[PDB]
Amino acid sequence: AVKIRLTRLGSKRNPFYRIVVADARSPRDGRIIEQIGTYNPTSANAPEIKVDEALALKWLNDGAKPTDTVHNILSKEGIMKKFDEQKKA
Amino acid sequence: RFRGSNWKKSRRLGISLSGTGKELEKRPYAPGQHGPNQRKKLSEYGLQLREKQKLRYLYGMTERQFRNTFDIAGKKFGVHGENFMILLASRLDAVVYSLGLARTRRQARQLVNHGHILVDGKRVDIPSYSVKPGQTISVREKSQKLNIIVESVEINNFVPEYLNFDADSLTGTFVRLPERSELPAEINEQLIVEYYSR
Amino acid sequence: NDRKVYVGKVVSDKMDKTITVLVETYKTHKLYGKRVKYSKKYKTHDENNSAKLGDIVKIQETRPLSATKRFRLVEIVEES
Amino acid sequence: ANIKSAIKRVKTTEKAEARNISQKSAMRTAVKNAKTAVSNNADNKNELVSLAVKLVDKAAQSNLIHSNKADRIKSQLMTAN
Amino acid sequence: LSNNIEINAYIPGIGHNLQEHSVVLVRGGRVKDLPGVRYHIVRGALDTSGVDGRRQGRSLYGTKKPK
RNA sequence: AUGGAGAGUUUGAUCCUGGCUCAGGAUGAACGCUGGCGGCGUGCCUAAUACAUGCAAGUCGAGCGAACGGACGAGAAGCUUGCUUCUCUGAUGUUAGCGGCGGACGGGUGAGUAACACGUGGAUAACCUACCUAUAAGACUGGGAUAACUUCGGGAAACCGGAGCUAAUACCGGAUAAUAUUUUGAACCGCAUGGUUCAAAAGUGAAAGACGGUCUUGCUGUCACUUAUAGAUGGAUCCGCGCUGCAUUAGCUAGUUGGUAAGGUAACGGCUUACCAAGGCAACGAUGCAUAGCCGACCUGAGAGGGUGAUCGGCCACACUGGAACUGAGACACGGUCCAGACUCCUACGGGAGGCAGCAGUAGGGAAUCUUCCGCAAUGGGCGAAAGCCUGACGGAGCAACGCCGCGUGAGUGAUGAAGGUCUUCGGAUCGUAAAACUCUGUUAUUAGGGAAGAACAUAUGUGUAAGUAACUGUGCACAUCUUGACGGUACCUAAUCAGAAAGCCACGGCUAACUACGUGCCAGCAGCCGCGGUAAUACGUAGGUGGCAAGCGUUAUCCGGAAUUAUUGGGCGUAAAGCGCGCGUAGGCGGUUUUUUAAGUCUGAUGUGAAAGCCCACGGCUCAACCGUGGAGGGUCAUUGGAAACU
Secondary structure, X not given: OEEXXXXXXXXXXXXXXXXXXXXXXOOOOOOOOEEEXXXXXXXXXXXXOEOOHHHHHHHHOOOOOOOOOHHHHHHHHOHHHHOHHHHHO | OOOOOHHHHHHHOOOOOOOOOOOOOOOOOOOOOOOOXXXXXXXXXXXXXXXXXXXXXXXXXXXXOOOOOOOOOOOOOOOHHHHHHHOOOOOOOHHHHHOOOOOOOHHHHHHHHHOOOOOOOOOOOOOOOOOOOOOOEOOOOOOOOOHHHHHHHOOOOXXXXXXXXXXXXXXXXXXXXXXXXXXXXXXXXXXXXXXOOO | XXXXXXXXXXXXXXXXXXXXXXXXXXXXXXXXXXXXXXXXXXXXXXXXXXXXXXXEEEEEEOOOOOOOOOEEEEEEEEOO | OOOOOHHHHHHHHHHHHHHHHHHHHHXXXXXXXXXXXXXXXXXXXXXXXXXXXXXXXXXXXXXXXXXXXXXXXXXXXXXXX | OOOOOOOOXXXXXXXXXXXXXXXXXXXXXXXXXXXXXOEEEOOOOOOOOOOOOOOOOOOOOOOOOOO
């Protein structure tokens, strides 16, 4: 099943995460389907979430599942709140 | 690094400028056992070497820091022979030496080593920080008064152009990139660039 | 979608509903840049032994109908 | 070095292949005679065919046989009948 | 050598320790004005020992720092 | 358009041809000498050789029987009036089994394969797809069985081989609905053919668990269930081109090439088997032998082009060697089975077992490549409502100057002859502002305090809100409380003390910037080239100098460049190497002038694509730099679509 994940980039003791909708059987740093945006815990103060929310909702409506940290990323912006209004309508 | 005598290197090259002059004591030709003799004339590869050494031992560098700061001068639109001159005086060795915080270059390099600068904020203790145009260079608040620091400001005047200086905790500014006029033209940059062409 | 629409020239009409066209085009050489003609015998599926030797035949690709023929006939521009 | 899960999978694949070949030979037998009963214009040319088409998708809703070999067998019976 | 082929190998230096059956490390490099030998021997690698008294070009010929 | 240099060497002396040898870059490098650190990387290239030991795939009691443990209602009382003897409501905990799902991913390796393996662009009106998401329709009624357990026999064993019981979301029987399938009609295409209503006959499912409220009930929320559609995904087959060296490999095929049938495959098909026909491929290199996983990329080059596949990604292939099938959505399966083989191991000799090209490690090979470490805290994966467990993936620690980039190893002064050691036309020029000794700094070293980001969650329990309900739990969403951290008392920051302890390495003829003196006297030896040594050696050996640059230096190996010494750009053939001894001619290559014409080549503009990472450019974060991140040249290779008509 396709699921939105975190593929880590960056160096040692400096994690940088790009957020990625990909299949669950591909490796972590391996082949992807589409790269939604980034995530950076080790910046100055913020996490610096960049998400193109018009495209992240194209995957959540046909089977992509956030896994416990991007579900916090999407809720930090507000994609998961706005996800209900497609189901409510 | 070098750690040796700048007197001997000023004998073989032009000058290292510890004081105002250093070659007047012995023969100004060459240091040891063949100096006071008939100076055999010197080929083109030698003279493309000697002016490179006169610039390297001036700032007190070594190769593959002198070479790795050469091809990154081949990135801007100016003349490559003098882009290498202008970003070589923008280090925290020349800027501490130019706006006078020391009577010479080596203890100016030793001043930026041990952490007496706090440039533009917290600290840069590296002696190869290329200073961007327009941020201040100070002295550390823990050590504002030393025998080395203050008693070398008053002797050496003429803080050069595209700089500032003050007595309010010794704060230079580094206005912009200096010109070839405001850079020591005792060593010609027009023949060092052919050494790295080979 | 649509399938490839090659044109050619028959070489040997043997028995049992098969002809082989000869699509000739011009690959260029890699290093020297000279054009050079080369051939490619494409087996194709005649319906009822229609086309004879000497004809120029327009063909189209299809699903694999045998071990070596992959193409079908559509139209005959000229014959002999 | 057998991991302790694979020693249980070899057990449950012998238990599950005995149930398969009992059912899978029954589907091949019940079409071996119904295809014979489509020939000869016999009595049960509409009763063994209803039994054969029954068993070839008892074994297709379960994963004995695929759901395109099921439709291929039941078309080879019901066209000729 | 390790592969079962025969060569001839020069010994640089002054004195050597090469009676027979010794294990030595063959270095490449031809020595001219000598027929049929085009290899050196690393002086000081496995069983050959360094020269007795060099202090000038000391790394090659393989002797350690005195005192 | 930031883009191109050379030198030495044939001769008594030139010019030319021509090879050779250097100066420049790199590496999974090795070796010799030497060696304070720090940050990021990298580290069996050989033997796809054999492997001791741990250890990498498990999970679910909310699928259900059993078991085991034990609180809690726990009698009479052995009177030791609290020890439980047993009895129990059994809360609740743990597992050996049955069962579901996962073991096909992640991880390793490059032996095989010159091939639709791969790259690129297409095609499937010849395809399959568990979980996930969405939409509807359902979940009815019965049955028997078998592990566990009890008992027996073989075996010291471990496990077989019997006998009798038991449960389920296990298995099985029967009802009920399909757009499947087979018969008959009306559209459009690109050949078989499709799509979308129709209308007739046969055919086919199933699961309950843990909640909620109230009716001794009957609806009910959560997520399993199976049925049909889609979407998303992953997979398969086919096709155009692009794919190493040999012609001192020129005939390859015989289910081979078509046909018509039949089987069978998810699917088309010589995929297989029958008959019928004699085709099929090949100098545009069939075949055969040899070599090699391919590509992004990396290295080099002014480009053209050459070289490589370590690391990091995509794909393929393999899992001691060779066949085969099972289970399943998916395998013909790396820590699965069966068979054959070669090795290896235990043994009470009765028969049992194992496959590091997973992670460290061992032996062996080798010039050469490391710890039998810590942790699931991060990210990812599996199974679960969930807590959570398992994860040698991964995150870290250790060793190695293996590479890159940073810092060091201390200067401000001042006898411009203190000592002493080279050279000396000995008077002096050198080492030398070198150096003792005077004044300060402490990067770092060490001890001694402080100390962190990575860390946001899930989960519980509270408040809303949305869907839904008769209502409430619950669910979706929103916030806000508290929860956990291998690295690690690490990064780092403050003080205390000391010029303490922290440089070698190769060159000195000329290319090539740096030389004098003793020793030795064709000897000992040097040498990249030319060449040095026979008594005055700037080339040997040492000593004082000096220079290249430095935690490295030098040698060797290999690759590209210099090499215009394979020349399309960009060479030649009178005598330097090179015109067949000349004809006739096949294939091929090339071909006079004009008009009309088409659009293959050609040119031009509309798209689409050539993933990410890197290269180039611009910013951001590392105290700078290495490095890391983001935004751009941009895909220029190709395919689809319009046009232009001179030149082939």
